[PDB]
Design a binder for this molecule. Structure first.
Ligand SMILES: [Cl-]
Ligand SMILES: [Cu+2]
Ligand SMILES: [Cu+2]
Ligand SMILES: [Cu+2]
Ligand SMILES: [Cu+2]
Ligand SMILES: [Cu+2]
Ligand SMILES: [Cu+2]
Ligand SMILES: [Cu+2]
Ligand SMILES: [Cu+2]
Ligand SMILES: [Cu+2]
Ligand SMILES: [Cu+2]
Ligand SMILES: [Cu+2]
Ligand SMILES: [Cu+2]
Lengths: 316, 317, 316
């Protein structure tokens, strides 16, 4: 089917951690960018308007661009950039399945590295794996890093000379992340993305993960892991069988990454919380203002197209 | 079987490198912590006493805690921390096989990153791979990194702002590491652990490694490698067939990791030393004061239980 | 067969980036060092003369040294170093197949990390995989990093206190790299090497890669990837089916690596250029002064031997 939608690029500010507001170039004014969910073989048309002061493009990472290389989104290679105020249309066929993503391809060290110019592109295969048919919850986790020194300074950052001192999943640093709420017998698909410039060793307490896909393609030899290393550009899909009720933290195991501005704890941390486990008064998230769509799990259930999420929106 | 262990947490100083003494929080006063070696299905009980000035926990990495989540060791999530001077008891069934490990889960960037709060937990499968049955030597290699600026000062370290300038296997930097001594026909299982905050590209000269297990679970499709990347939290088990007598260095291939305080050589380096090879006068480790248990290989042969090792012990104040 | 080669080590300066000339210790005066291409089972003899001011060795990474450990090239372990002015002969049997490499093993953090002391050693199996049979182009990509503060002075570099601020493939930083020119229907074997001390997330636009070999040995379970993480010491071999004509960039996805001295773009970037695609006025590499052997692809067709390449030579 043909799926057409409209995306903008906006100058907004998001809160990454307590105390750290960050100027970003958000697709539809949000970080992560909107979810795009389509079916294998769909024809996609994306109309992009740059409402920022700098040039950008959008590259569709994982999308082959078969016979459509001029929609690959690479400035000086496949197109001239989308200047401030201008618009550009991408057209491609979603013939490559799985967990893909999209991001700016201008000034990538800064724009992708610290300005939030990325989001998920999920292509459902015609022939999912049998285990994918058992999935009851689909979870997107996009990891990235932040350089507090350039939080207010578009046009700066993302170099070797900078210091990445904050770390996140879906643009929040613990405790501003959200729990992964499950119930016993859930079958949870988690998609990890190396969205920013860091490496993330994603470890699930209480559970092993079955690694089923690399860069959205199914492995002939899936393997179990309790820690999955995710580097820039990569995706890994896993399955967790939610058969062990408790509260089980789930986090980046790289030691410096569970800090925030040199303070601990922080960083890419969530908690697998099972329904019905009694809550101790000392539980760090006992009073959480819960967002069930923090990992796009609700959006993923609502059809094919483009989805914004108000909890990812920044301020103008 | 029910297996019960009494563990302490101690403030000691260890020598990581020539001229680098480091204040650590050593389980039973050693870094790596004691080896815990049990069988699949055992019921484990660990009574922990905190003899340091700061709060800690112990998390059992890879242990599922099936029905026992309150023993997962995570402060603010599954327990309150073990305060200084206090005790706490962990109980879990070892129903997850393979190379596991344990580490503090309080202030982890510092405690696990530079204070040595970690050790190996080996769970023997009831049904091991056939190749595992050919093994004649079992070897633990726990890699980590150290920030010399915070060596003498608990309470700091383990941030992006710090500089990790020393590197080790089992908490020593070459030349203070020990050789891996084999003889022709040995079948060597090596268990790599990303215990600290760095990445380590472990390369064996003279041999390929057959990678058989990821995070302690056997791969359906094992593969050969001469360089295995190990990142925080992970374990890899490999087999080396010792069929090539020589002196073959075995080291982290990340170029800045074979330094110590900005000087070379140093870092996570050993040598696969074959017994039959005559020693040259210029060999760096001629006459080495040798520790046969530097990789826990002797302890690993001594039955199920918990094993200290004095080559890992630090000095009390 | 017995194959005997004479190699030298020379003090030369190379141009890594616009703005960065670097003093290196080039094997045969070039970086990458010469391609050594031999067959499984050959007896190799390499006579090395050290025409530099500092001691060196050559270690043959991935070569087992069966019966020949004294040629392993490790100072203080298998030999005394080759002093300045002196010569030394290596002998080994190439019984280990695949993508191997060679590098100095004296002061490795500096000599291999920033002084270019490395090159490729390709051992052809007497029995290649079936996929290798279809290959029409063979490509070598050796990634490394550079520290501009020590560019002019041997004896410093390669420590955690230094700053790696330039990144390359085959010792050039974009735009001084060269395109990978292909034609529709090509079957491209690419061999990635982690020659320096960095990690490189190599991502091909427009195509998936079939990962067929790890450290030169064929995988029982090959797998597709669009991004392959290459770390120090490792090699990965992939296959790309060149069936999607366009201009498709191919680069390290680690965000800070696509910079050069703090500025973007730079780093390990190439473009898969298909013959016949019209060149746009704004194409960055329009009119490139092209080197068809930048990835050793011409040398790799020339049989067994040791191959210098003038494009890699430094100046005295
Ligand atoms: Cl022997
Ligand atoms: Cu942009
Ligand atoms: Cu990308
Ligand atoms: Cu891409
Ligand atoms: Cu943990
Ligand atoms: Cu602790
Ligand atoms: Cu852990
Ligand atoms: Cu854990
Ligand atoms: Cu080596
Ligand atoms: Cu050298
Ligand atoms: Cu090497
Ligand atoms: Cu080697
Ligand atoms: Cu790209």
């Amino acid at each position: 089917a043909e799926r057409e939608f409209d995306m903008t690029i906006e100058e907004v500010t998001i809160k990454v951690a307590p105390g750290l507001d960050y100027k970003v170039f958000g697709f539809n004014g949000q970080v992560p960018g909107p979810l795009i969910h389509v079916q294998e073989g769909d024809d996609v048309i994306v109309n992009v308007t740059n409402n920022t002061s700098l040039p950008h493009t959008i590259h569709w990472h994982g999308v082959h661009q078969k016979g459509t290389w001029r929609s690959d989104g690479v400035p000086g290679v496949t197109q001239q950039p989308i200047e401030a105020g201008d618009s550009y249309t991408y057209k491609f066929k979603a013939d490559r399945i799985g967990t893909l993503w999209y991001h700016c391809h201008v000034n990538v060290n800064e724009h992708v590295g610290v300005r939030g110019m990325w989001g998920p592109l999920i292509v459902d295969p015609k022939q999912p794996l049998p285990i994918e048919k058992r999935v009851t919850k689909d979870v997107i986790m996009m990891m990235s890093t932040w350089e507090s020194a350039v939080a207010d300074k578009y046009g700066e950052g993302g170099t070797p000379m900078n210091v990445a001192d904050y770390f996140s999943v879906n643009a929040k640093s613990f405790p501003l992340t959200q729990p992964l709420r499950v119930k016993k017998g859930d079958v949870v698909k988690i998609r990890f993305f190396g969205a920013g410039g860091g490496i993330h060793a994603m470890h699930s307490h209480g559970h092993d993960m079955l690694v089923t896909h690399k860069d959205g393609l199914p492995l002939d030899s899936p393997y179990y892991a309790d820690t999955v290393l995710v580097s820039p550009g990569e995706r890994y899909d896993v399955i967790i069988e939610a058969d062990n009720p408790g509260r089980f933290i789930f986090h980046d195991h790289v030691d410096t990454h569970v800090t925030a501005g040199g303070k601990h704890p922080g960083g890419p941390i969530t908690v697998i919380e099972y329904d019905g486990v009694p809550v101790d008064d000392w539980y760090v998230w006992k009073d959480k203002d819960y967002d069930p769509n923090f990992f796009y799990s609700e959006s993923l259930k609502q059809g094919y197209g483009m989805f914004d999420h108000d909890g990812f929106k920044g301020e103008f």
